[PDB]
Each structure stands twice: as structure tokens, then as C-alpha cells.
Design a protein around this motif. Sequence first.
Motif, PDB file in Angstrom:
ATOM      1  N   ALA A 177       3.829  10.090  -9.841  1.00 27.83           N
ATOM      2  CA  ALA A 177       3.163  10.310 -11.122  1.00 27.83           C
ATOM      3  C   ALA A 177       2.478  11.670 -11.162  1.00 27.83           C
ATOM      4  O   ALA A 177       2.551  12.385 -12.173  1.00 27.83           O
ATOM      5  CB  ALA A 177       2.158   9.191 -11.388  1.00 27.83           C
ATOM      6  N   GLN A 178       1.806  12.048 -10.072  1.00 27.24           N
ATOM      7  CA  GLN A 178       1.166  13.360 -10.036  1.00 27.24           C
ATOM      8  C   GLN A 178       2.193  14.482 -10.127  1.00 27.24           C
ATOM      9  O   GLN A 178       1.968  15.487 -10.817  1.00 27.24           O
ATOM     10  CB  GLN A 178       0.317  13.503  -8.774  1.00 27.24           C
ATOM     11  CG  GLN A 178      -1.104  12.998  -8.930  1.00 27.24           C
ATOM     12  CD  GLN A 178      -1.630  12.344  -7.673  1.00 27.24           C
ATOM     13  OE1 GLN A 178      -1.231  12.695  -6.564  1.00 27.24           O
ATOM     14  NE2 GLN A 178      -2.540  11.394  -7.839  1.00 27.24           N
ATOM     15  N   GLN A 224       5.086  14.370 -11.644  1.00 30.49           N
ATOM     16  CA  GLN A 224       5.574  14.429 -13.019  1.00 30.49           C
ATOM     17  C   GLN A 224       4.547  15.071 -13.950  1.00 30.49           C
ATOM     18  O   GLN A 224       4.910  15.827 -14.865  1.00 30.49           O
ATOM     19  CB  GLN A 224       5.956  13.028 -13.490  1.00 30.49           C
ATOM     20  CG  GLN A 224       7.308  12.569 -12.975  1.00 30.49           C
ATOM     21  CD  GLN A 224       7.286  11.147 -12.461  1.00 30.49           C
ATOM     22  OE1 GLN A 224       6.322  10.416 -12.673  1.00 30.49           O
ATOM     23  NE2 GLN A 224       8.350  10.750 -11.775  1.00 30.49           N
ATOM     24  N   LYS A 225       3.259  14.793 -13.730  1.00 30.92           N
ATOM     25  CA  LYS A 225       2.229  15.469 -14.515  1.00 30.92           C
ATOM     26  C   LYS A 225       2.262  16.975 -14.281  1.00 30.92           C
ATOM     27  O   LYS A 225       2.098  17.766 -15.221  1.00 30.92           O
ATOM     28  CB  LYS A 225       0.847  14.913 -14.179  1.00 30.92           C
ATOM     29  CG  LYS A 225      -0.222  15.321 -15.178  1.00 30.92           C
ATOM     30  CD  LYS A 225      -1.475  14.477 -15.040  1.00 30.92           C
ATOM     31  CE  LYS A 225      -2.379  15.001 -13.942  1.00 30.92           C
ATOM     32  NZ  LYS A 225      -3.394  15.946 -14.482  1.00 30.92           N
ATOM     33  N   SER A 251       2.563   1.725  -3.435  1.00 31.41           N
ATOM     34  CA  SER A 251       1.614   2.205  -4.433  1.00 31.41           C
ATOM     35  C   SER A 251       1.326   3.690  -4.243  1.00 31.41           C
ATOM     36  O   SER A 251       1.235   4.444  -5.223  1.00 31.41           O
ATOM     37  CB  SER A 251       0.327   1.388  -4.362  1.00 31.41           C
ATOM     38  OG  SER A 251      -0.506   1.833  -3.307  1.00 31.41           O
ATOM     39  N   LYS A 252       1.187   4.130  -2.989  1.00 33.44           N
ATOM     40  CA  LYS A 252       0.982   5.553  -2.735  1.00 33.44           C
ATOM     41  C   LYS A 252       2.175   6.375  -3.211  1.00 33.44           C
ATOM     42  O   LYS A 252       2.006   7.462  -3.783  1.00 33.44           O
ATOM     43  CB  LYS A 252       0.724   5.792  -1.250  1.00 33.44           C
ATOM     44  CG  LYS A 252      -0.594   5.226  -0.752  1.00 33.44           C
ATOM     45  CD  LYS A 252      -0.659   5.253   0.764  1.00 33.44           C
ATOM     46  CE  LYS A 252      -1.981   4.713   1.273  1.00 33.44           C
ATOM     47  NZ  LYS A 252      -1.993   4.620   2.757  1.00 33.44           N
ATOM     48  N   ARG A 300       4.237   5.634  -5.664  1.00 29.28           N
ATOM     49  CA  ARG A 300       4.181   5.700  -7.123  1.00 29.28           C
ATOM     50  C   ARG A 300       3.149   6.717  -7.593  1.00 29.28           C
ATOM     51  O   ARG A 300       3.411   7.501  -8.515  1.00 29.28           O
ATOM     52  CB  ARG A 300       3.860   4.332  -7.719  1.00 29.28           C
ATOM     53  CG  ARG A 300       4.885   3.249  -7.466  1.00 29.28           C
ATOM     54  CD  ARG A 300       4.273   1.889  -7.755  1.00 29.28           C
ATOM     55  NE  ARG A 300       5.081   0.788  -7.249  1.00 29.28           N
ATOM     56  CZ  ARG A 300       4.708  -0.484  -7.284  1.00 29.28           C
ATOM     57  NH1 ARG A 300       3.547  -0.849  -7.801  1.00 29.28           N
ATOM     58  NH2 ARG A 300       5.522  -1.413  -6.791  1.00 29.28           N
ATOM     59  N   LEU A 301       1.964   6.712  -6.978  1.00 32.32           N
ATOM     60  CA  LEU A 301       0.920   7.641  -7.398  1.00 32.32           C
ATOM     61  C   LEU A 301       1.357   9.087  -7.189  1.00 32.32           C
ATOM     62  O   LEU A 301       1.136   9.946  -8.057  1.00 32.32           O
ATOM     63  CB  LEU A 301      -0.372   7.350  -6.640  1.00 32.32           C
ATOM     64  CG  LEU A 301      -1.548   8.284  -6.913  1.00 32.32           C
ATOM     65  CD1 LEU A 301      -1.974   8.169  -8.364  1.00 32.32           C
ATOM     66  CD2 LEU A 301      -2.708   7.965  -5.989  1.00 32.32           C
ATOM     67  N   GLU A 349       0.828  -1.205   0.000  1.00 24.57           N
ATOM     68  CA  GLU A 349       0.000   0.000   0.000  1.00 24.57           C
ATOM     69  C   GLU A 349       0.864   1.256   0.000  1.00 24.57           C
ATOM     70  O   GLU A 349       0.626   2.190  -0.782  1.00 24.57           O
ATOM     71  CB  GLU A 349      -0.938  -0.017   1.207  1.00 24.57           C
ATOM     72  CG  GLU A 349      -1.970   1.087   1.220  1.00 24.57           C
ATOM     73  CD  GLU A 349      -2.771   1.107   2.503  1.00 24.57           C
ATOM     74  OE1 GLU A 349      -2.499   0.268   3.387  1.00 24.57           O
ATOM     75  OE2 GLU A 349      -3.684   1.951   2.620  1.00 24.57           O
TER      76      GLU A 349
END
Lengths: 55, 51
Positions: free
Chosen positions: B35-36, B38-39, B28-29, B31-32, B25
Amino acid sequence: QPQPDPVQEQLKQLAVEKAQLENEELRSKIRLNDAQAQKAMAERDNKNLDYLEQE
Amino acid sequence: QPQPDPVQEQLKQLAVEKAQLENEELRSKIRLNDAQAQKAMAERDNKNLDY
């Protein structure tokens, strides 16, 4: 000989099921987090392509 | 000789499983969040180009 009570045994079985379902819920949550991660990655890639085209 | 209780072994195994899954868990947090970020970097670059 002690006399059993169905209530306690049934509640214990329910508790074990609850623990298993909690573990499954955690797996579902990690799946959601991963999927949102690739979604954000794809959006970033599209934005970078737009940047390269517009430049 | 002690008499083992089947329910307690299963409970301990389930607790170990939960302790294992919490780490996934957390990863995964992480990674998320990356990703945000980098966006956000991509969008700020686009806005700078527009300016």
C-alpha cells in the motif's frame, strides 16, 4: 506426600496468562497493520482522483 | 499408564497458536508495504504532472 508451594503454581498460572495475552497482542498488531493498509489505499485513491481532475 | 499433565497440553496449543499468528503478521506487513509503495507511485505521478 510432597508438600506443595503456592509460589510455583501461581507463577505457572501467570505464565499461561502471559502466553494468552501475547497471542492477543499479535492479533491487535495485525489489526493495526491492516487498518493502516486501507488508510494508505484511500489516500492513494484520492491522489489519483486529484491527478485525473488536474490533467 | 502415563498421567497426562494439563498445563503442558495448553502450553503446546498456545505455541501452535503463536506459530499460526506469525504468518498473519507477515502477510499484514506485506499488504502495508504494498500500500505504501502504491501511494508513492500515485504521488510521483502527481509530481510529474505538476512538472
